[PDB]
Design a protein around this ligand. Sequence first.
Ligand code: 0VQ
Length: 253
Amino acid sequence: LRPKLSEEQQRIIAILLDAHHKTYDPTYSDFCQFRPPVRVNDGGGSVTLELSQLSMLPHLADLVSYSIQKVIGFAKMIPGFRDLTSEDQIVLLKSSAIEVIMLRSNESFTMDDMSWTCGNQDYKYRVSDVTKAGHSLELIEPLIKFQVGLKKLNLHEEEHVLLMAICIVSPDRPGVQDAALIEAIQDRLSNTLQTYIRCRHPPPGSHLLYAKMIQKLADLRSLNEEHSKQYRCLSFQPECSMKLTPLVLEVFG
Ligand SMILES: CC/C(=C\C=C\C(O)(C(F)(F)F)C(F)(F)F)c1cccc(CCc2ccc(CO)c(CO)c2)c1
């Protein structure tokens, strides 16, 4: 059966697409406002050198901080999100932050050279740039694999924004109070996504796509955990706080 999208589901998709268009700048025009990227010589991927310099951290931290602000903006536009208490809203935002950033960054990710390309050489981010910010291959390699896998799903923008919404409105996040309400909102979103795939996504992929998308959400949980561990290590580096931002410190601290 291929039921048609209800008027409510059509509205949801329209709202989410609009929300994304208002919070994701495909030209990355604000990136020049961040502290400048600095790339020190580290062909050997020396952890000691990377930690002593953290050359790319100010720039990446500003980019992630900027991204978190956009995600907060996007989340506020998710139908039903504002029906949640402020406490639950913040809990969901802090816990899904890095995951949603990983998902949204897929738009700049390119398989041409496996990088996040946001402009000229200066704003092209490779595995080496992320290691220069203090992260290790234990996170980066799996992240790249995740980006490629997501790219290969060839998601429609409608599916992309629904996936980000579903990621944010997860009832299984530690600290949530009204799990039932959150689950109701997520179910409304998941049903919209399943209905959309069944009647708008052409084969080969009309089906099976939903399961693959849900598996990406599970993958994100593992990446989230690894990122938290790496952030912990990074925070132990003296003077690291100045290289971050108040928003980043609160969300991951
Ligand atoms: C390895 C994971 C990570 C960031 C980690 C950052 C921090 O741990 C620290 F400290 F290092 F700064 C933080 F800030 F969290 F604390 C990361 C995840 C996904 C991508 C990228 C690459 C860059 C890119 C990001 C976001 C968007 C859009 O938001 C776009 C443009 O699409 C490009 C990096």
